[PDB]
Protein backbone atom coordinates (compact mmCIF):
# COMPACT_ATOMS: atom_id res chain seq x y z
CA UNK A 1 0.00 0.00 0.00
CA UNK A 2 1.11 3.60 -0.51
CA UNK A 3 0.81 4.21 3.27
CA UNK A 4 3.11 1.27 4.05
CA UNK A 5 5.82 2.23 1.54
CA UNK A 6 5.69 5.88 2.77
CA UNK A 7 6.23 4.94 6.43
CA UNK A 8 8.90 2.39 5.64
CA UNK A 9 10.84 4.91 3.48
CA UNK A 10 10.40 7.76 5.95
CA UNK A 11 11.58 5.75 8.92
CA UNK A 12 14.31 4.04 6.85
CA UNK A 13 15.77 7.45 5.90
CA UNK A 14 16.06 8.57 9.57
CA UNK A 15 19.65 7.70 10.66
CA UNK A 16 19.65 5.17 13.48
CA UNK A 17 21.53 6.07 16.64
CA UNK A 18 24.41 4.09 18.06
CA UNK A 19 25.40 4.79 21.63
CA UNK A 20 23.58 3.24 24.53
CA UNK A 21 24.05 6.21 26.92
CA UNK A 22 21.81 8.53 28.91
CA UNK A 23 22.38 11.78 30.83
CA UNK A 24 24.39 10.13 33.61
CA UNK A 25 27.03 8.92 31.16
CA UNK A 26 29.51 11.86 30.71
CA UNK A 27 31.48 11.74 27.39
CA UNK A 28 29.27 8.91 26.16
CA UNK A 29 26.21 11.18 26.67
CA UNK A 30 27.98 13.90 24.66
CA UNK A 31 28.43 11.38 21.86
CA UNK A 32 24.79 10.32 22.13
CA UNK A 33 23.72 13.96 21.84
CA UNK A 34 25.77 14.41 18.70
CA UNK A 35 24.01 11.36 17.27
CA UNK A 36 20.63 12.78 18.29
CA UNK A 37 21.34 16.13 16.57
CA UNK A 38 22.64 14.37 13.47
CA UNK A 39 19.55 12.17 13.28
CA UNK A 40 17.25 15.13 13.88
CA UNK A 41 18.99 17.29 11.28
CA UNK A 42 18.81 14.57 8.61
CA UNK A 43 15.11 13.99 9.41
CA UNK A 44 14.41 17.73 9.09
CA UNK A 45 16.31 17.80 5.75
CA UNK A 46 14.16 14.89 4.54
CA UNK A 47 11.03 16.68 5.75
CA UNK A 48 12.02 19.83 3.82
CA UNK A 49 12.59 17.73 0.69
CA UNK A 50 9.17 16.07 1.10
CA UNK A 51 7.36 19.42 1.49
CA UNK A 52 6.41 18.65 5.07
CA UNK A 53 8.80 20.57 7.31
CA UNK A 54 6.64 19.97 10.38
CA UNK A 55 8.88 20.51 13.47
CA UNK A 56 11.88 22.09 15.09
CA UNK A 57 13.51 20.96 18.34
CA UNK A 58 16.26 22.42 20.52
CA UNK A 59 17.66 21.56 23.94
CA UNK A 60 19.46 23.03 26.88
CA UNK A 61 23.24 22.63 26.88
CA UNK A 62 23.09 19.42 28.89
CA UNK A 63 20.59 17.85 26.41
CA UNK A 64 18.13 16.95 29.21
CA UNK A 65 15.36 19.46 28.40
CA UNK A 66 13.91 19.77 24.89
CA UNK A 67 11.50 22.35 23.47
CA UNK A 68 10.39 23.34 20.01
CA UNK A 69 7.49 23.71 17.65
CA UNK A 70 5.34 21.60 15.39
CA UNK A 71 3.00 22.51 12.57
CA UNK A 72 -0.02 20.81 11.08
CA UNK A 73 -1.60 21.88 7.76
CA UNK A 74 -5.36 21.27 7.43
CA UNK A 75 -7.65 22.74 4.77
CA UNK A 76 -4.95 25.18 3.59
CA UNK A 77 -4.38 26.64 7.09
CA UNK A 78 -1.29 26.25 9.26
CA UNK A 79 -1.60 25.36 12.95
CA UNK A 80 1.37 25.84 15.27
CA UNK A 81 1.90 24.16 18.68
CA UNK A 82 4.71 24.43 21.21
CA UNK A 83 6.25 21.13 22.36
CA UNK A 84 8.55 20.15 25.17
CA UNK A 85 9.91 17.14 26.96
CA UNK A 86 12.45 16.04 29.58
CA UNK A 87 14.95 13.23 29.04
CA UNK A 88 14.52 10.52 31.74
CA UNK A 89 17.66 9.28 33.39
CA UNK A 90 17.06 5.78 31.95
CA UNK A 91 17.05 7.06 28.36
CA UNK A 92 17.49 5.68 25.77
CA UNK A 93 15.80 2.58 27.21
CA UNK A 94 12.99 4.74 28.47
CA UNK A 95 11.42 7.09 25.94
CA UNK A 96 10.60 10.68 26.94
CA UNK A 97 7.03 11.85 27.18
CA UNK A 98 6.29 14.59 24.68
CA UNK A 99 4.06 17.37 25.91
CA UNK A 100 2.00 19.91 24.03
CA UNK A 101 1.13 22.19 26.99
CA UNK A 102 -1.23 24.50 25.16
CA UNK A 103 -3.49 21.50 24.44
CA UNK A 104 -3.75 20.44 28.10
CA UNK A 105 -7.39 19.80 28.92
CA UNK A 106 -8.45 19.98 25.26
CA UNK A 107 -8.22 16.27 24.31
CA UNK A 108 -8.70 13.05 26.26
CA UNK A 109 -5.83 11.41 24.37
CA UNK A 110 -3.39 12.99 26.79
CA UNK A 111 -2.19 12.64 30.39
CA UNK A 112 -1.48 15.55 32.74
CA UNK A 113 0.53 18.57 31.63
CA UNK A 114 -0.18 18.10 27.92
CA UNK A 115 1.69 14.75 27.80
CA UNK A 116 0.36 13.03 24.65
CA UNK A 117 -1.03 9.50 24.90
CA UNK A 118 0.33 7.22 22.18
CA UNK A 119 -1.05 3.79 21.33
CA UNK A 120 0.01 0.74 23.33
CA UNK A 121 2.08 -0.46 20.39
CA UNK A 122 4.57 2.44 20.84
CA UNK A 123 6.29 1.15 23.99
CA UNK A 124 7.05 -2.41 22.67
CA UNK A 125 8.26 -0.94 19.38
CA UNK A 126 10.58 1.46 21.19
CA UNK A 127 11.86 -1.21 23.61
CA UNK A 128 12.81 -3.74 20.92
CA UNK A 129 14.81 -1.08 19.00
CA UNK A 130 16.96 0.26 21.90
CA UNK A 131 19.30 2.01 21.40
CA UNK A 132 18.86 2.66 17.65
CA UNK A 133 15.76 4.85 18.13
CA UNK A 134 16.18 8.41 19.28
CA UNK A 135 14.32 11.68 19.34
CA UNK A 136 13.87 11.79 15.54
CA UNK A 137 12.04 8.44 15.76
CA UNK A 138 10.03 9.73 18.75
CA UNK A 139 8.86 12.59 16.54
CA UNK A 140 8.24 10.46 13.39
CA UNK A 141 6.53 7.55 15.14
CA UNK A 142 5.08 9.22 18.24
CA UNK A 143 4.12 12.86 17.90
CA UNK A 144 3.57 12.94 14.11
CA UNK A 145 0.90 10.21 14.06
CA UNK A 146 -0.69 11.63 17.21
CA UNK A 147 -1.09 15.03 15.49
CA UNK A 148 -2.49 13.39 12.32
CA UNK A 149 -5.29 11.88 14.36
CA UNK A 150 -5.94 14.50 17.02
CA UNK A 151 -5.51 17.88 15.30
CA UNK A 152 -8.23 17.41 12.56
CA UNK A 153 -10.62 16.31 15.34
CA UNK A 154 -9.98 19.36 17.52
CA UNK A 155 -10.39 21.62 14.50
CA UNK A 156 -13.63 19.95 13.36
CA UNK A 157 -15.04 20.42 16.88
CA UNK A 158 -13.91 24.05 17.10
CA UNK A 159 -11.74 23.35 20.20
CA UNK A 160 -8.79 24.87 18.37
CA UNK A 161 -9.10 27.88 16.11
CA UNK A 162 -6.09 28.85 14.03
CA UNK B 1 -9.88 -28.13 8.04
CA UNK B 2 -7.28 -25.35 8.65
CA UNK B 3 -6.98 -21.86 7.11
CA UNK B 4 -3.91 -19.59 7.03
CA UNK B 5 -3.77 -15.82 7.41
CA UNK B 6 -0.93 -13.52 6.56
CA UNK B 7 -0.99 -10.95 9.35
CA UNK B 8 1.06 -7.77 9.14
CA UNK B 9 1.85 -5.66 12.17
CA UNK B 10 1.27 -2.12 10.87
CA UNK B 11 2.61 -0.35 13.94
CA UNK B 12 6.15 -1.54 13.20
CA UNK B 13 7.77 0.34 10.30
CA UNK B 14 9.44 -2.83 9.03
CA UNK B 15 5.86 -4.11 8.44
CA UNK B 16 6.72 -7.64 9.57
CA UNK B 17 4.25 -10.42 9.02
CA UNK B 18 3.43 -13.81 10.39
CA UNK B 19 1.32 -16.59 8.88
CA UNK B 20 -1.03 -18.10 11.42
CA UNK B 21 -2.83 -21.34 10.69
CA UNK B 22 -5.97 -22.17 12.69
CA UNK B 23 -8.87 -24.63 12.40
CA UNK B 24 -11.61 -23.20 10.18
CA UNK B 25 -14.10 -23.24 13.06
CA UNK B 26 -11.82 -21.13 15.33
CA UNK B 27 -13.71 -18.02 16.58
CA UNK B 28 -12.10 -14.97 14.94
CA UNK B 29 -11.60 -13.31 18.38
CA UNK B 30 -9.14 -16.18 19.12
CA UNK B 31 -7.25 -15.27 15.93
CA UNK B 32 -6.93 -11.72 17.29
CA UNK B 33 -5.68 -13.03 20.66
CA UNK B 34 -3.24 -15.40 18.88
CA UNK B 35 -1.89 -12.61 16.64
CA UNK B 36 -1.54 -10.19 19.58
CA UNK B 37 0.32 -12.84 21.63
CA UNK B 38 2.63 -13.57 18.70
CA UNK B 39 3.45 -9.90 18.11
CA UNK B 40 3.78 -9.27 21.90
CA UNK B 41 1.09 -6.56 21.89
CA UNK B 42 -2.00 -6.45 24.12
CA UNK B 43 -5.10 -7.99 22.62
CA UNK B 44 -7.38 -5.35 24.19
CA UNK B 45 -5.59 -2.44 22.47
CA UNK B 46 -5.17 -4.18 19.13
CA UNK B 47 -7.54 -4.92 16.27
CA UNK B 48 -7.48 -6.81 13.02
CA UNK B 49 -8.69 -5.37 9.72
CA UNK B 50 -8.36 -6.55 6.14
CA UNK B 51 -5.32 -5.86 3.96
CA UNK B 52 -7.40 -3.14 2.28
CA UNK B 53 -8.49 -1.39 5.49
CA UNK B 54 -11.90 -2.89 6.07
CA UNK B 55 -13.44 -3.63 9.45
CA UNK B 56 -14.11 -7.25 10.35
CA UNK B 57 -17.04 -8.37 12.49
CA UNK B 58 -15.42 -10.49 15.27
CA UNK B 59 -18.54 -12.65 15.70
CA UNK B 60 -17.64 -15.23 13.07
CA UNK B 61 -15.22 -18.07 12.45
CA UNK B 62 -11.78 -17.90 10.88
CA UNK B 63 -13.11 -19.83 7.90
CA UNK B 64 -15.92 -17.26 7.52
CA UNK B 65 -13.34 -14.40 7.50
CA UNK B 66 -10.94 -16.27 5.18
CA UNK B 67 -13.63 -16.53 2.46
CA UNK B 68 -15.51 -13.28 3.06
CA UNK B 69 -12.45 -11.07 3.40
CA UNK B 70 -9.33 -13.00 2.29
CA UNK B 71 -6.17 -14.43 3.89
CA UNK B 72 -4.31 -11.09 4.19
CA UNK B 73 -4.88 -9.12 7.40
CA UNK B 74 -3.45 -6.19 9.29
CA UNK B 75 -3.05 -6.02 13.07
CA UNK B 76 -3.36 -2.40 14.14
CA UNK B 77 -3.43 -0.40 17.42
CA UNK B 78 -7.02 0.07 18.58
CA UNK B 79 -9.00 3.12 19.69
CA UNK B 80 -9.19 2.56 23.49
CA UNK B 81 -9.75 4.79 26.52
CA UNK B 82 -7.12 5.53 29.17
Residue B51: give its domain's CATH number. 3.10.20.90
Residue B14, min C-alpha distance to chain A (Å): 6
Is B46 in Cβ contact with A8 (below 8 Å)? no
CA A103 to chain centre: 16
Question: Is residue A131 reached through a cis peptide bond, with omega within 30 degrees of 0 on the bond before it?
Answer: yes
Rounded Cα–Cα distance for residues A36 and A63 (Å): 10
Residue B82 lies in a domain: no
Residue A137 lies in a domain: yes
Is A119 in Cβ contact with B13 (below 8 Å)? no
Which H or E run contains A126? helix A122-127
Coil, strand or helix at A68 = strand
The total number of structural domains that make up chain A = 1
With beta carbons under 8 A apart, name residues in chain A contacting B11. Answer: 119, 121-122, 125
Is B15 in Cβ contact with A119 (below 8 Å)? no
Distances (CA, A) of B45 to A143, A147, B33: 19, 19, 11
Rounded Cα–Cα distance for residues A75 and A59 (Å): 32
Is B41 in Cβ contact with A120 (below 8 Å)? yes
User: Alpha-carbon torsion A33, A36, A42, A46, what sign?
Assistant: negative
Size of interface A-B (CB pairs under 8 A): 35
The total number of structural domains that make up chain B = 1
Do A40 and A53 form a contact (C-beta atoms < 8 A)? Answer: no
Do B12 and A119 form a contact (C-beta atoms < 8 A)? Answer: no
Residue A161 lies in a domain: no
Residues 6+ apart with CB under 8 A from A81: A69, A70, A71, A72, A100, A102, A103, A147
Rounded Cα–Cα distance for residues B79 and B82 (Å): 10
Residue A162 lies in a domain: no
Do A131 and A19 form a contact (C-beta atoms < 8 A)? Answer: yes
Residue B21 lies in a domain: yes
Residues in chain A: 162
Residue B67, min C-alpha distance to chain A (Å): 22
Do A73 and A107 form a contact (C-beta atoms < 8 A)? Answer: no
Rounded Cα–Cα distance for residues A96 and A5 (Å): 27
- Closest residue in A to B12 (Cα–Cα): A125
Residue A134 lies in a domain: yes
Task: Write out the residue range of the structural domain in which residue B17 sits.
Answer: 2-77
Residue A145 lies in a domain: yes
Which own/partner pairs from A67-73 qualify as long-range (CB within 8 Å, at least 24 positions apart)?
A70/A100, A70/A143, A70/A147, A72/A147, A72/A148, A72/A151
Method: X-ray
**Cα dihedral: A58, A62, A63, A68 (round 10):** -20
Task: Write out the residue range of the structural domain in which residue A152 sits.
Answer: 2-156
Give phi and psi for B57, each to the nearest 5: -70, 125
Residue B69 lies in a domain: yes
Give phi and psi for B21, each to the nearest 5: -110, 130
In terms of DSSP H, where are the helices of chain B?
A: 28-39, 62-68
Residue A70 lies in a domain: yes
Residue A117 lies in a domain: yes
Residue B40, min C-alpha distance to chain A (Å): 8
Do B25 and B48 form a contact (C-beta atoms < 8 A)? Answer: no
Amino acid sequence: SMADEATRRVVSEIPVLKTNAGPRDRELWVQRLKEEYQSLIRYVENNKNADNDWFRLESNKEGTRWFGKCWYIHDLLKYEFDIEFDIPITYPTTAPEIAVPELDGKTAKMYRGGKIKLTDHFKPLWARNVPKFGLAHLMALGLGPWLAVEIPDLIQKGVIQH
Amino acid sequence: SKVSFKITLTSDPRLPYKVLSVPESTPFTAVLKFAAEEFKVPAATSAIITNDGIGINPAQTAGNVFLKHGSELRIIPRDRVG
